Amino acid sequence: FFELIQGTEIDIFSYKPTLLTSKTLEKIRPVFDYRCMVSGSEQKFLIGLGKSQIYTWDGRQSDRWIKLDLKTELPRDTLLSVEIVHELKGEGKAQRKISAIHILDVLVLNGTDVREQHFNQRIQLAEKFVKAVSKPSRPDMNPIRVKEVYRLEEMEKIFVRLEMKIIKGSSGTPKLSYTGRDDRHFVPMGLYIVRTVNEPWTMGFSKSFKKKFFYNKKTKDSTFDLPADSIAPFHICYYGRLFWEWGDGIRVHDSQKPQDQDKLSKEDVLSFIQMHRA
Amino acid sequence: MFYHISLEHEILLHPRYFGPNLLNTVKQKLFTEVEGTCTGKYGFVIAVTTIDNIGAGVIQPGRGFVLYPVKYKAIVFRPFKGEVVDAVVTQVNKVGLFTEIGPMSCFISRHSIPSEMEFDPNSNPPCYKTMDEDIVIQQDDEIRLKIVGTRVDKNDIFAIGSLMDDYLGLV
Amino acid sequence: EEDASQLIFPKEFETAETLLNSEVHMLLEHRKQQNESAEDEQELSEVFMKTLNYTARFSRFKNRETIASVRSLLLQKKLHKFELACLANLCPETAEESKALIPSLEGRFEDEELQQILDDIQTKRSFQ
Amino acid sequence: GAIFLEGVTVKGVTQVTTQPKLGEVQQKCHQFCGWEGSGFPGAQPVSMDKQNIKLLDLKPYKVSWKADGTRYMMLIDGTNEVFMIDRDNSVFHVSNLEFPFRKDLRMHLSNTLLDGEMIIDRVNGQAVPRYLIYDIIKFNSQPVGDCDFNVRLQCIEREIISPRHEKMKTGLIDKTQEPFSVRNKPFFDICTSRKLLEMDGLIFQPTGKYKPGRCDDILKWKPPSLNSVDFRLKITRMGGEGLLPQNVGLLYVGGYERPFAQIKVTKELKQYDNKIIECKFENNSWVFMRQRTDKSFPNAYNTAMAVCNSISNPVTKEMLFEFIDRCTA
């Protein structure tokens, strides 16, 4: 890990997400600077030393690297930001849940550093990597996936994939479930909001040109092309991240009752986003 | 069943470990010695709730260390023959079923699992499922099992459960 | 020699007083909070962690006032401690299931009174 | 021990594991020092104690400011012929560093051996490596080490520096191309240490010929604050019949078969198990300042002890000062 980080400060890996609350909602402005993804476990770092020599770490300097107890393989010199997600198949007694590695972001891929590339661009390299390490002849192996990344101005598309499903062991009580690109779902814990544009830049929408543009708040310059210094590298994306937790009392699907009035609903976050798209 | 009982255990204090505070040393010694243990008569010793009584310290003749009989409220657990208990599945095997009840490993053999719940390695988790694909017992599930018998080995109990009678399987 | 289906317990487990799963969760999280303070004391057993997360997963009564209400409503019922705790932990919904998971409840209570008590359990279950 | 200088990587410097070349480089150093045993020929200084400091009055001394650095003898044999030697005997080839002969600038130096340290420096907030030449053993096979420390000090100036400066004046040498800066540590007569005081201490250098090996008359002074020893940290539960099997942090030193000392094991100390731990001394206790990633083994035992001989019978920041000022009269 110290070799792969090349003298980057270790404290960067210890930063906790800012909780999204009515007091922190203003931080998601401007809306176009952000991406979002549905979380199904706590975030961890993962290092690949080759084959089944895969280890995880929870970002605290006190914590040991733990060997990953999953039947999966990764190239040496691989450093990922991940979560572990169990994918339930079916419902109730017939329900079958399989844990899967879900990549949230990437730093190093088989000795290629990608940390300074744009979040979507880093994810583009990450998406190809999951196919590269894929093993479809080996249904006994634990799957690696990339998270579905949404534009923050399209968060409405996430709630259409939230369903109330009967999980094995929930005493028959339906649980909130996020359904992926396949016939698998997981119980969501919340939603990460990641900044992809670096200061002093920000993304506007031009009503005259019907296109997004980058605006430099210091120079007052505007461009329709991606400025190289507008790119948020991994450390800015990781440090600047918000987390909207989806615990009890939070309404994100219409079948949930009762709502806690001190907690942001889907309707509050979507209304705020709609007011700040324009 | 998760039990709240009172237990008696004797602590041996060498005079090197007296200190200015003597009784806190005995409390830390009891929290070290019996927490996390398992005995055949009293089961899984989970924790010590409240150290009730500290006995009189009998200096053993010829020995140096003092001996404290100690009564203490304790949370324990004991597995029982025929008790229907909730459990977490850890592994589905073609021979049996590794589940957990607390720290206890429980092994449910397939020969005492009915003919509906067949084994499948061809699913990406190897699991227990029927031909209707309705009851799917796989890893990290919440199930219920009837404990037939327990075997204690090396100062710890493991158990054997079953699913033969009614209303057993997935919650 | 022992049999939990007919309350056949050893003589050591005669004064055995039961506990609920949320009671075990609350008291062991209090022990974990005692371990968080009061330093120069190491981490507890692997048994402690496994029991604590095990009863955290299967916890049904999210309030201690819920614990006290279930304990007050069941303790005034002519049950053994074992039958009381196994009912309040497994939480069945039909009185046939109440007699099937616990075969020592055969004829202790009337099955309509038993279904009243099970509906009181499902009334006092803190849902998720 | 392929880390050349820790805190930076440097262009062209490379460990030498080639069997024919290494045996040569080492052999030629032993040769040039007239050195006896195995390993590093370089003169080794010793720590000032209340007994040593009496020597500053027995003969003439020069003094300079130690900085923590790494000890490297530089062997200049030819054209790309420059090499560097470790406290370890590790050998490194240096590439674009060139030493002109003072008479003929077209020629290069051969059969020259230098003593000095590699130090990292600060101007721009970024690391600039420097080699400081603090002594010279051989020049053209000329045995300048048997000459007098001012003679050797001057030699280094006109033979190894002025020439590299002239060729830089002309653009035959773009300072920029060379892996590191090259400089001579300035030394001062004894009487000037009062005006002076990453500089961690003092060095007291005698006027006599260079000697390889342990030099009891070359004195390194460190303020007793910075005294530190590197132990390997081993913590084990210790209550076999004892009531409390509290795990206890034991400290280990090289050469000693059993435990040297004990440290009270902190909640944070634990993850350092098997790894070198660096300790200071304060309260009749040891303390953990940092971790070192550059060694898999502790200090030599007799090193730890000569650390202690230093801490308990210390030469104080003030004791040294009175001793110098009195003799400056």
Helix (H, G, I), strand (E, B), or coil: what is residue D75? Answer: strand
Task: Check residue D300 and report its DSSP letter.
Answer: B
- Is any Cβ of chain C less than 8 angstroms from the Cβ of B36? yes
- Which residues 28-47 on chain B approach chain D with CB closer than 8 angstroms? 28-29, 32
- Which residues 58-97 on chain A approach chain D with CB closer than 8 angstroms? 62, 64
Residue pair B158/A174 in contact by the 8 Å Cβ criterion? no
User: What is the per-residue DSSP string for A81-126?
Assistant: EEEEEEEEESSGGG-EEEEEEEEEEEEEETTEE-TTS-HHHHHHHH
| Residue numbers in D near A64 (CB within 8 A) | 271
CA dist B137 and B90 (Å) reads 11
Percentages of chain B per state (helix, strand, coil), in multiples of 5: 10, 50, 40
Residues 6+ apart with CB under 8 A from C64: C22, C26
Buried b (16+ CB within 10 A) or exposed e, A143-178: bbbbbebbebbebeebeeebeebbbbbbeeeeebbb
Q: Which of B81, B77, B97 is nearest to B137 (CA)?
A: B97
CA dist A68 and A84 (Å) reads 10
Q: B100, B132, B141: which to substitute to probe chain A, counting the most A Cβ within 10 Å?
A: B141
- Is any Cβ of chain B less than 8 angstroms from the Cβ of D245? yes
User: In this structure, what token pair is assigned to residue B26?
Assistant: 């005995």
Could you tell me which chain C residue has the CA closest to the CA of A174? C128
Distance from CA of D233 to the nearest CA of B (A): 24
User: In this structure, what token pair is assigned to residue B116?
Assistant: 């509906």
Helix (H, G, I), strand (E, B), or coil: what is residue D326? Answer: helix
User: In this structure, what token pair is assigned to residue D159?
Assistant: 């033979």
CA dist D188 and A240 (Å) reads 54
Residue pair A128/B171 in contact by the 8 Å Cβ criterion? no
| Residue numbers in B near A185 (CB within 8 A) | none
User: Which phi and psi (to 5°) does residue D41 adopt?
Assistant: -75, -20
Helix (H, G, I), strand (E, B), or coil: what is residue D97? Answer: coil
Is-cis flag, bond preceding D212, omega within 30? no
C-alpha torsion sign, points A5, A6, A9, A12: negative
PDB experimental method: cryo-EM
Residue pair C21/C60 in contact by the 8 Å Cβ criterion? yes
CA dist D108 and D79 (Å) reads 6
Selecting from B123, B132, B142 the residue whose C-beta is nearest the C-beta of A96 gives B123
Q: Which of B86, B123, B143, C127 is nearest to A168 (CA)?
A: B143
Q: Which of B144, B150, B8 is nearest to B88 (CA)?
A: B144
Q: If residue A201 lies in a helix (H) or strand (E), which one and from where to where?
A: strand A201-206
- Is any Cβ of chain A less than 8 angstroms from the Cβ of D268? yes
Residue pair A242/A19 in contact by the 8 Å Cβ criterion? yes
CA dist D280 and D289 (Å) reads 7
Burial class (CB in 10 A: 0-12, 13-18, 19+), A5: middle
- Is any Cβ of chain D less than 8 angstroms from the Cβ of B71? no
CA dist A83 and B100 (Å) reads 24
Residues 6+ apart with CB under 8 A from A34: A28, A151, A152, A193, A194, A195, A196
Burial class (CB in 10 A: 0-12, 13-18, 19+), B84: buried
Q: Which of D112, D120, D135, D107 is nearest to D10 (CA)?
A: D120
Residues 6+ apart with CB under 8 A from B79: B43, B85, B101, B104, B147, B150, B157, B159
D220 is in an annotated binding site: yes
Q: Which of A104, A122, A261, A115 is nearest to A189 (CA)?
A: A104
Task: Check residue D254 and report its DSSP letter.
Answer: B
User: How many interface pairs between A and B have CB atoms less than 8 angstroms apart?
Assistant: 65
Helices (H), chain D: 19-33, 149-160, 162-169, 301-312, 317-327
Distance from CA of D224 to the nearest CA of A (A): 31
Distance from CA of D250 to the nearest CA of A (A): 20
Residues 6+ apart with CB under 8 A from D258: none
Selecting from B11, B17, B28 the residue whose C-beta is nearest the C-beta of D242 gives B17
Note whether D268 contacts A62, CB cutoff 8 Å: yes
Between helices D149-160 and D162-169, what is the axis angle to 10°?
A: 20
| Residue numbers in D near A62 (CB within 8 A) | 268, 271
Report the amino acid identity of residue A174.
P
Max Cα–Cα distance, chain C, nearest Å: 56
Residue with tokens 């440090």: A239
CA dist B139 and A211 (Å) reads 49
User: In this structure, what token pair is assigned to residue C86?
Assistant: 């196994």
Question: D184 — alpha (psi -120 to 50), left (phi > 0) or beta?
Answer: beta
CA dist D148 and D152 (Å) reads 6
Q: Structural domain boundaries of chain C? A: 1-128
Could you tell me which chain A residue has the CA closest to the CA of C60? A171
- Which residues 131-160 on chain B approach chain C with CB closer than 8 angstroms? 142, 144, 147
Q: If residue A270 lies in a helix (H) or strand (E), which one and from where to where?
A: helix A266-275
- Is any Cβ of chain C less than 8 angstroms from the Cβ of B59? no
Distance from CA of C100 to the nearest CA of B (A): 7
Given the DSSP bridges, would you call strands D247-252 and B2-13 parallel, antiparallel or unpaired?
unpaired
Burial class (CB in 10 A: 0-12, 13-18, 19+), C46: exposed
| Residue numbers in B near C41 (CB within 8 A) | 28
Alpha carbon distance, N-terminus to C-terminus of chain D? 48
Cα angle for residues B158, B100, C20 (degrees, 5° grid) = 100
Distance from CA of B124 to the nearest CA of A (A): 5
Note whether B2 contacts C18, CB cutoff 8 Å: yes
Q: Please confirm, yes or no, whether D66 is among the known catalytic residues.
A: yes
Helices (H), chain B: 23-33
Task: Check residue B164 and report its DSSP letter.
Answer: -
CA dist C54 and C34 (Å) reads 20
User: In this structure, what token pair is assigned to residue A91?
Assistant: 């419902």
- Is any Cβ of chain A less than 8 angstroms from the Cβ of C91? yes
C-alpha torsion sign, points D241, D242, D243, D248: negative
D27 is in an annotated binding site: no
Between helices C21-36 and C64-75, what is the axis angle to 10°?
A: 140
Residue pair D88/D29 in contact by the 8 Å Cβ criterion? no
D293 is in an annotated binding site: yes
CA dist A199 and A197 (Å) reads 7
Max Cα–Cα distance, chain D, nearest Å: 80
- What does chain B come to in residues? 171
Residues 6+ apart with CB under 8 A from B144: B84, B85, B86, B87, B167, B168, B169, B171, C90, C101
- Is any Cβ of chain A less than 8 angstroms from the Cβ of C127? yes
Max Cα–Cα distance, chain B, nearest Å: 73
Q: Which of A97, A63, A65 is nearest to A187 (CA)?
A: A97
Could you tell me which chain C residue has the CA closest to the CA of B146? C101
D65 is in an annotated binding site: no
Residue pair D253/D304 in contact by the 8 Å Cβ criterion? yes
Task: Check residue A256 and report its DSSP letter.
Answer: -
CA dist A185 and A189 (Å) reads 13
- State CA D87 to chain mean position distance: 8
User: Which phi and psi (to 5°) does residue B15 adopt?
Assistant: -65, -15
CA dist B151 and B38 (Å) reads 12
Note whether A173 contacts C91, CB cutoff 8 Å: no
Residue pair C115/A160 in contact by the 8 Å Cβ criterion? no
Q: 10 Å Cβ neighbour count for D33?
A: 22
Report the amino acid identity of residue B69.
P
Residue with tokens 């590093």: D40
CA dist B36 and D178 (Å) reads 65
CA dist A106 and A114 (Å) reads 7
CA dist D115 and D133 (Å) reads 6
Q: Which of D275, D323, D239 is nearest to D54 (CA)?
A: D323
Given the DSSP bridges, would you call strands A112-113 and A96-109 parallel, antiparallel or unpaired?
antiparallel
Is-cis flag, bond preceding A30, omega within 30? yes
Q: 10 Å Cβ neighbour count for D113?
A: 26
CA dist D198 and A188 (Å) reads 52
D292 is in an annotated binding site: yes
User: Which phi and psi (to 5°) does residue A175 adopt?
Assistant: -115, 145
Distance from CA of A118 to the nearest CA of C (A): 39
Report the amino acid identity of residue D43.
A
Rounded to whole angstroms, what are the CA distances from D121 to A9, B81, D203?
A: 21, 75, 19
Alpha carbon distance, N-terminus to C-terminus of chain B? 19
Name the strands in the sheet holding A34-39, side by side, starting at the edge strand that comes first in the sequence: A18-19, A242-245, A190-195, A34-39, A150-151
| Residue numbers in A near C91 (CB within 8 A) | 171
- State CA D211 to chain mean position distance: 16
SS (H, E, C) chain C: CCEHHHCECCCHHHCCEECCHHHHHHHHHHHHHHHHCCCCCCCCCHHHHHHHHHHHHCCCCCCHHHHHHHHHHHHCCCCCHHHHHHHHHHCCCCHHHHHHHCHHHCCCCCHHHHHHHHHHHHHHCCCC
Note whether C54 contacts B47, CB cutoff 8 Å: no
Q: Rg (Cα) of chain D, in Å, rounded?
A: 22
| Residue numbers in A near C60 (CB within 8 A) | 171
Instruction: Single out the catalytic residue among D11, D21, D62, D66.
Output: D66
Q: Which of D147, D177, D171 is nearest to D159 (CA)?
A: D147
Between helices C111-124 and C64-75, what is the axis angle to 10°?
A: 170
Q: Which of C97, C87, C96 is nearest to C120 (CA)?
A: C87
Resolution in A for the shown PDB structure? 3.9
